Symmetry: C5
Subunit: 111 residues, 5 copies
């Protein structure tokens, strides 16, 4: 169980409104985290309040976990600090259409 | 007394200007916190300085505890960092009408 | 000497350009602090760079201690982090006219 | 192996879209870091979302590591906090044309 | 060698483009620091990207050490965190004309 700070980036767009921060099955048993850093914008981003949420469970119920909200007219960027995500965790777009570049650091363990 | 980091979100709008971050009575005896993260906006938000306050007591007097202030024209979002709220705690809107999406992390203990 | 985290708010306006964060004389002997959090705006705030300063002494000389600066046209809010004020400490408005809502946390000791 | 906090600055422009934060070969064996601080803009900066990325490897694949994004119309500056870069590391401009002044602190060891 | 947290402020303007954070000769032998906090603006500030740099030496060469950059049109204020300056250290204005109010905390030792 040795550390690697493998940086990570993903895209939430119209045809990728839902995405998964995922670790392979043989590696899920180890301590894996995601230090979330920053979100940028693409060309097709709608000029409205794009909202990025975390999707996990609620004791058997569906849940959206608010993470970020932006709009290129006044807020092209948002600063979220202090979130460590343990895979698997779903990214979802509550509002807007994307694309949004979500960048963080996959802290992974490898044998 | 085991930890759960149950994420949480609430809505402060015209008919919900006052809301309560509350833990059930059988669970109040344990160490419960609320890591406050972020606030977003809804459709009916008035374009003025919405102000979100904490309501607790003042040695027998009513109190508003300033937490956030925003306005979608120039400040659609506000970044509040370092606030842990122990339930029960009231959310109140000092100015504006809402809606405002208040998101944080209910750190709860369960037996 | 037991702690209380008594939250606090004050108003710096035209007729209250100078204000005092003060602890009663029987309680000055204890460790008292002020975790400064946030500043909001009132109705009569002039649309120019309001500046909030701390007033203490300079080995026998008067001093203004820069703390915050804002203007509702582009900066309705300012984020000051890391300031603990030991009472008595004066709030002064170097520029502008107010009103400004200064909110923080009086960490007080009581017997 | 003694520390020096040698401050550092570089320019990413049209003819310098790729740059290298590099330490000399005789000094690579020591613990070298780069506390990244701030990015400013030049005269020829295009008024669009300039994006600065880190270039390293992906287990044999090319990678861009999102670091900053700005645009002088609304975001002339970006605040990136918490990044320590161990040389050699490539700076690349994913979008835009520059120039961009990237400033940080080369924490270097010398014999 | 006893501590004093003597707060400090200085002005970088057209006729004061260069300034010195200095400690008296009889006191230079002690551990002296400057926790840099904040920069505000004056009346004669040009509406362009004012840049504040630190001036020290480069193994016999002149150096400018980027610290802050602002412009009252979109960035009337800049938030620089984590800089402790040991006197003597020169403040210089790389771009712009000032005035700029630089405020921090001279952590000084006195016998």
């Amino acid at each position: 169980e040795k550390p690697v700070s493998l940086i990570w980036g993903c895209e939430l767009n119209e045809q990728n409104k839902t995405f998964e921060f995922k670790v392979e099955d043989d590696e899920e048993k180890c301590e894996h985290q995601l230090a979330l850093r920053t979100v940028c914008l693409g060309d097709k981003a709608k000029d409205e309040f794009h909202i990025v949420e975390i999707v996990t469970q609620e004791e058997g119920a569906e849940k959206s976990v608010p993470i970020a909200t932006l709009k290129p007219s006044i807020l092209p960027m948002a600063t979220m600090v202090g979130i460590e995500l343990t895979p698997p965790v779903t990214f979802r777009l509550k509002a807007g259409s994307g694309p949004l570049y979500i960048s963080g650091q996959h802290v992974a363990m490898e044998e």
